[PDB]
Every structure is written in C-alpha cells, then in structure tokens.
C-alpha cells in the first residue's frame, strides 16, 4: 500500500467473515533517511571502532533492515557520498557526560570511522550530524548503547536440556541495562542470545547433576553478565561458563524453600558505579525469609518473618507471609508484599506493602486496603516515577496504586467488567511490560493484548494481531519498541524463533480515532537533559520548564519530591497569552543555605545535611494521546571521592627512582630512622 | 570597488522661453570615470520630496 495524501485512511480487507477496519494516520515529514553503524571491539587498547553510513529504508538491501550488514549496498554508498559532498558529517555524543567524537574523511567505500573509549559508566550515546538536506530530506538522530561485549555460553556435547513444565507458558528474562542480551525458557529448550534472538545458543546442564523429572520443572530464570541463575523445583542453581554448582547453606540460602528472585529493572548504572561500595544485585524470597544477593553469588539473610511480625505490632501467632520483593526506582530501597491472615479461618487475606530503606536500614508500613482470596498469586512492578506507583496483577485482574498510594484501585475496561479473563475467553494474564514513556502492555496466554497508561485507570483492549494458538512472547528491540517473538518447534532450526515488530502507537491512534480522546496541552518542554545531578556546597541547580496549552484551561507544572528534604526551592513564573494559546514558563532553583563557621560538631552538621533526593516534573492534568516523557532525576549532596587537589609540576610516577632511607635527629619537637 | 553618490542640479534649457521664469528644465550631474574600469552602474532615485 502506497499513498501521498496525508490524514487518516480507513483500510479494510473485505472477506467472507467480519473483519475490523483500521485507520492509519500518515503525515508529511522532512525526515527520511537513517544512520547505520557497525562496531568492532579491540581489547588491547580498550577501545571501540564504529563505522557509519547513511541508508534509505525504502531503497535498501535486505540485510541493512535486520542489522546484519558489513558492507554498504549500492544505494547506500551513492547516497552517503552524495550527502558527504553537500557537507554532512556525523559525530557521536555521549549523554551522561557531554563529550563528542568526530570522524575522519570518507574512505574508498562510503564509511565514516570513529574511535571511542570503552566506558561502562556512560553507556548511552547518540549519533548526530549537521542540518544538511539532500533533496528536501533529512537524517534522523540515532540513539543507542554500547559497553564491553558480553559473551554467551557455549555448549559441550553430551549435555541435557532444561525445560519449563509441560503446557506452561514460556518465559523470558533480559538484562536490565543493555537489552538484546536475553534468555528464553521454553518447554523443549532454553535459549540465550547476544542479539535480539537473531542468532542463539542453547543452555544445557552436565549429566548426572539433576534428575530427568527435575530438568522439566524450572520455575524461574534470571540473567546477569557473570552467569545465569535457575530456580529448579525450589532450589537455586548457578550456571556459568565453567561449572553448574548448586547453591546451598554454605552461600546463605535454604534448600527446597525458595519461591522467587528478582533483580533491578531500571538502568541506574551511574550512581551504582560512583557509589564506591558493592551493593546487592539480586533479592530472593522463600515465603518466610528474604535474602539479598551480592556479587560473586553469596549472600546473608536480610530478614525473617518474626522481625517483621514484631515491627507491625502484630498480636503474634499470626499467619504473615511474603509473596514478592521488588527494587523500586530509588537505587537503595526495596519493597515487599506482606500477606496477613487476621485470625484466619476464612479465604480472605490482607495485602500490605513494607518498604525497606538500606541507607537508614529501616522499615516503613504503607497504606493498602486490599483484600484477596487465598488462591491468588501476586506480581507487582514499579513504574518510572520518583514516587512509589505500583502496577500489580493476580492472573485475572490488574490493580493499581498511583500518586503516593492515594489513588488505589482496580484497572477496568470502559465497559467496567474489571475481569480481563471474561474479555479474553477465560485465559490468565501471562505478561506485563512497562516502559520509560509510561505505557504498559498486558498480554494473556490467549495472545490478546490490553493497554494501560500510567496514572490512567481505564484500560484499552487492542485489536487482535496474533493467532490464538501461537506460542509467543513480547520483548524489546535495541530501542524501546515492542517486538513479538514467535517460537515453534518442528522447523528447520533457522525459523524456530522469529521476531516481528508491533506498531503499538499506530494501533493506539486508530483506537483513539474510534473513541475521540485528546491531549489537553499543546506542548511541555524542559531542560532536564540528564538523570543524575551532583553538586557541592557552593553550587545551585537551575531547572527550566514550560507548558503551552489552549486558551484558558487552567494548568500548571507539578513538581513532586521524594526522599530526604535537605534543600529549598524558589520558583519564578511568567504567564503569556497569544493567538488563543496560554504559556506558563517556570524557572526553579535548588540551593542550600547553611553556615559552618564558628559552630560545634562541624562533621555532624556536615553529615546531617548530606544525601540524595528525587524530583519529578509533570503537567497538571494529562490523559492518553500524550506522548510526553515525564522527567525524573535525582540530586545528591556529598563528595564523589574522585575530586582532589594537586600542586603544579608534581606527579606520581613520571620521575623514576629507588628506595631511600635516612636518619633525622635533634630537630624534632631523639633518633628517627625513616 | 568604488561608489560615488551625487545629487543632480536643475538647469534651464536655452531656447525661446516665451514665459518669464520657467520653461523646459532638466537635471544635470557630471559623469566621473576612474582609471582601471570600463563598467559603471548608475542608480537614480528620488530625494523623498
């Protein structure tokens, strides 16, 4: 299908049965072409070499569309040299720290070569260029990530496969910082991939370690760079490229008790690296005890249920249990779901949340008023927000807690059934995916998908896109777009795992065109270009933001803070009305105003006014059809332990010498040999 | 490259002139040329009145 006139177009396949019609929105754009890069890693110099050219997605080769190319095609080469003649050059710009890298001249084949350090601290990068157009067409910037290459395991012959129980839905877990490195557990095999499942390598176990029945009861998996963790029948096993050693009491876990484990979900790499202290990378739970796994895979018990029973003033001899633990967006905090019986003898149980703070090593009890039956199992996740806002599900429903545990309830359809099994032919919830922008996708084992927006209660049932019997999963590509992965055995081993993208935004726009919702503001801009701000005694932070909205619907910019308040704000506001649009422009400044001169307990006051806090900016009222990403950042006060002083002309080891020894006497404040 | 800006001076044409003061009347200015060139652009406009 081709067309040139813009707008919305209604397309429909007329067939024997009833097929729904779809509205596709097409708009004119002056951005047409794209960047393509290929990396190579050299470890002797600890560096990366990237090669970049320009390609057009309409007239490209087949390889350049699936990211498997090494040499530019004829169209890409000709386009690259034509845009080089007009004066276009790409440069790579690191995001966390603002350093730029420039290319050399164009080589014999169309290729710009840029050299780059290996960082592991600033892994987010953009690749950009000048404002040079070819024939009224631009090139779009490209966002990407790269770190040290991560090796996937190899397979020795004679090993045995590890499977999920028969008939159970296949599961997937990926790395928290760099995606396209994931492990998928199925009913017949376990796969691991260094890309988005283009090439894959199986994961197996040495003979004799586990029984055949045990090999078919894998409950959960988790994936790190060092190795993989399996939860086989309530026992945690560790698979590394060397051995398949089983965790026991010698490493701080119990046997045949473990119910689950979890890792971090948001890539807070910068604060974790700059912390200069190794913290936990995993948390496990066994229905009566939470454990906090550090690196090298050994851990001490975090908390038993008796201490929490003492904390919650409970009248003792009560059935108090744990069901899930998650790492929220605060980098040094955890949350745990607490199931409470209340003199039992019924099927109804209370669900509460207890928050554990590691900086202060304390516990807090929150506001939850949720009753649930015994049979329900719960899984909850934290959204991209400074404040704790959870999305929780129990394989028939989805409950929500928004705006600091005030807006708590059940997510419902516009009809109001509130049961997602009745709209999905009686199938249970299989997967829930959150993202940075704020959109959640709920997928059942029937392969039907619902959509939720954060801070929005109503759900939207999306149109059917995939079959009923297909064995699928949902994942993310190199960018943060959704992709559906089809798995089918009885094939030629080259098509057992096929990935196709899912255009979620277009389907949402079609649904909205059917419905008729709208975004109440025209625009919301800010200058928060980062996530981690650090500042010393004598500095302040200036944050700028602006809303442009229709004529007199009274809006404003809500600033929300979480953590320890150690600062002050001053906000200045400007209001303008022009051409039927109002504009509200706000500048806010963060500063500290304490004096340490001639005071007692200088170090105690210095410690009392240090730490981190979290801020988020958002518009006053918003709904769907708003593609704004809500800015969330953190400010820490304290020294980074990487800044110091040096006298000029001096250095550690530019001047080579040997050992010295000398005696000093009669001039100290008797005989010193040093 | 050189510019020169001038203002044209009125002058009466010598003829019969049946009337007393005014008759055929024109505006005159010198034509200056410098050594090293053969091409001159001459832009005429009004003084605003």
């Amino acid at each position: 299908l081709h067309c040139k006139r813009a707008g919305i177009h209604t397309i429909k396949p007329i067939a024997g049965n009833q097929e729904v019609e779809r509205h596709l929105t097409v708009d004119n754009s002056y951005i047409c072409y794209l960047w393509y890069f290929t990396v190579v890693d050299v470890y002797y110099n600890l560096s990366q070499i990237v090669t970049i050219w320009v390609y057009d997605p309409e007239s490209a080769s087949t390889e350049e569309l699936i990211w498997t190319a090494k040499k530019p095609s004829l169209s890409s080469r000709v386009l690259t040299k034509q845009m080089n003649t007009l004066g276009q050059r790409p440069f790579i710009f690191t995001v966390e720290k603002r350093l730029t890298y420039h290319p050399g001249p164009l080589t014999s084949e169309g290729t710009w070569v840029i050299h780059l350090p290996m960082s592991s601290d600033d892994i987010a990068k953009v690749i950009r260029g000048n404002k040079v157009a070819f024939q009224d067409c631009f090139i779009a910037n490209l966002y990407f990530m790269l770190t040290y290459p991560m090796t996937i395991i190899s397979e020795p012959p004679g090993y045995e496969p590890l499977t999920v129980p028969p008939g159970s839905p296949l599961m997937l877990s990926w790395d928290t910082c760099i995606s396209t490195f994931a492990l998928l557990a199925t009913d017949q095999e376990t796969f691991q991939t260094n890309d988005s499942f283009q090439t894959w390598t199986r994961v197996r176990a040495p003979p004799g370690i586990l029984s055949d029945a045990q090999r078919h009861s894998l409950r959960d998996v988790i994936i790190f760079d060092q190795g993989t963790l399996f939860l086989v029948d309530g026992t945690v096993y560790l698979r590394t490229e060397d051995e398949f050693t089983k965790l026991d009491e010698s490493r701080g876990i119990s046997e045949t008790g473990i119910l689950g484990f979890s890792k971090r979900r948001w890539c807070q790499i910068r604060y974790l690296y700059k912390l200069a202290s190794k913290k936990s990378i995993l948390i496990a739970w066994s229905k009566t005890t939470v454990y906090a796994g550090y690196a090298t895979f050994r851990f001490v018990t975090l908390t038993d249920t008796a201490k929490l029973k003492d904390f919650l003033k409970l009248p003792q001899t009560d059935t108090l249990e744990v069901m899930s633990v998650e790492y929220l967006w605060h980098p040094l905090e955890a949350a745990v779901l607490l199931s409470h019986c209340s003199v039992c003898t019924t099927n109804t149980r209370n669900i509460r949340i207890v928050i554990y703070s590691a900086i202060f090593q304390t516990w807090t009890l929150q506001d939850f008023e949720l009753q649930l039956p015994k049979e329900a199992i719960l899984e909850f996740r934290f959204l991209y927000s400074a404040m704790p806002d959870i999305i929780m599900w129990d394989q028939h429903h989805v409950y929500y807690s928004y705006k600091n545990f005030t807006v708590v309830g059940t997510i419902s359809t516009p009809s109001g059934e509130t049961n997602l099994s009745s709209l999905s032919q009686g199938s249970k919830i299989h997967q829930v995916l959150t993202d940075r922008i704020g959109n959640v996708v709920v997928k059942m084992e029937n392969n039907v998908m619902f959509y939720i927006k954060a801070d929005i209660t109503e759900a939207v049932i999306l149109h059917t896109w995939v079959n009923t019997t297909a064995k699928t999963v949902v994942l993310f590509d190199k960018s943060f777009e959704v992709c559906i992965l089809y798995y089918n055995e009885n094939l030629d081993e080259k098509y057992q795992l096929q990935t196709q993208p899912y255009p979620l935004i277009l389907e949402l726009q079609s649904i909205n065109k059917d419905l008729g919702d709208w975004c109440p503001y025209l625009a919301f801009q800010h200058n928060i270009h980062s996530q981690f701000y650090h500042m010393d005694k004598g500095e302040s932070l200036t944050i700028w933001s602006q809303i442009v909205y229709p004529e007199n619907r009274g809006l404003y910019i809500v600033v929300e803070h979480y953590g320890s308040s150690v600062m002050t704000w001053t906000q200045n506001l400007e209001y303008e009305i022009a051409s039927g649009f109002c504009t509200k422009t706000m500048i806010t400044r963060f500063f500290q105003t304490t004096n340490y001169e001639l005071v007692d307990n200088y170090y105690q006051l210095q410690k009392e006014n240090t730490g981190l806090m979290l801020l988020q900016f958002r518009p006053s009222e918003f709904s769907r059809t708003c593609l704004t990403a809500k800015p969330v950042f953190e400010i820490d006060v304290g020294c980074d332990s990487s800044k110091y002083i040096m006298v000029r002309g001096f250095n550690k080891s530019r001047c080579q010498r040997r050992d010295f020894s000398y005696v000093i006497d009669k001039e100290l404040l008797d005989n010193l040999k040093v | 490259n050189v510019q020169i800006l001038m203002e044209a001076a009125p002058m009466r044409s010598t003829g019969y002139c049946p009337a007393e003061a005014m008759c055929v009347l024109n505006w005159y200015t010198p034509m200056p040329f410098k050594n090293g060139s053969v091409v001159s652009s001459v832009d005429i406009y009004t003084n605003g009145i």
């Binding site: - | 050189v2 510019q3 020169i4 800006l5 044209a8 001076a9 002058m11 005159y28 200015t29 010198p30």
Partner: protein, 99 residues
C-alpha cells in the same frame, strides 16, 4: 525575516564618497554653465585625491580630503557670511563637508 545582518558596505568591502553640488544664490534656484563646471572640477579633484592616496608614508589622519580642507577651515564662518548676505563670488557656496 532576515534580521541580525552584517552591514552591506563593510561586508562587500567598498569605499564610498559623497559629492553634493555647490549652492546658488539665484532667486529661482537654477544653475548655469559655470556652476556645473565648478561641480565637475570638484568631483575630479576628489577622485584624483582618492587615486593619489597610494603614498607609502602614513598621514596623521585618514580621509585624504583632510589634506584638502585643512588650511582653509579656520575661517569657514566668514565664507558663510559672504554668501548668506550675497557679497561673494558668483553666488556659489562651496561647502567643505559636502565632498
């Protein structure tokens, strides 16, 4: 709008001279043969001064016409007195800031 633009003459690197005609004390305001001849002579001398400023010795002041109007500008007011009251020359007032 094309705003914040550099100056035309400075960017294109052109020198510019101004030469206005000498005034007349005739009641109607017309010129004649001799007044136009004086205009031609003054414009010629201005261009000759421009072309003769290629001297390799630096003068204290720019604007080569400074060498022209230096020994005569000490008594400009007197000249005006002779022209306003019509007691001078052919009723021609040769200004000094006009060339």
């Amino acid at each position: 709008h094309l705003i914040d633009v550099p100056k035309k003459h400075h960017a294109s690197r052109t020198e510019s001279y101004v030469a206005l005609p000498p005034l007349v004390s005739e009641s109607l305001g017309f010129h004649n043969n001799n007044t136009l001849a004086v205009y031609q002579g003054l414009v010629y001398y201005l261009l000759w001064l421009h072309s003769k400023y290629d001297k390799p010795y630096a003068d204290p002041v720019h604007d080569p016409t400074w060498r022209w109007w230096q020994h005569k500008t000490k008594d400009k007011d007197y000249f005006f007195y002779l022209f306003s009251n019509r007691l001078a020359a052919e009723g021609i007032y040769i200004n000094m800031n006009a060339y």
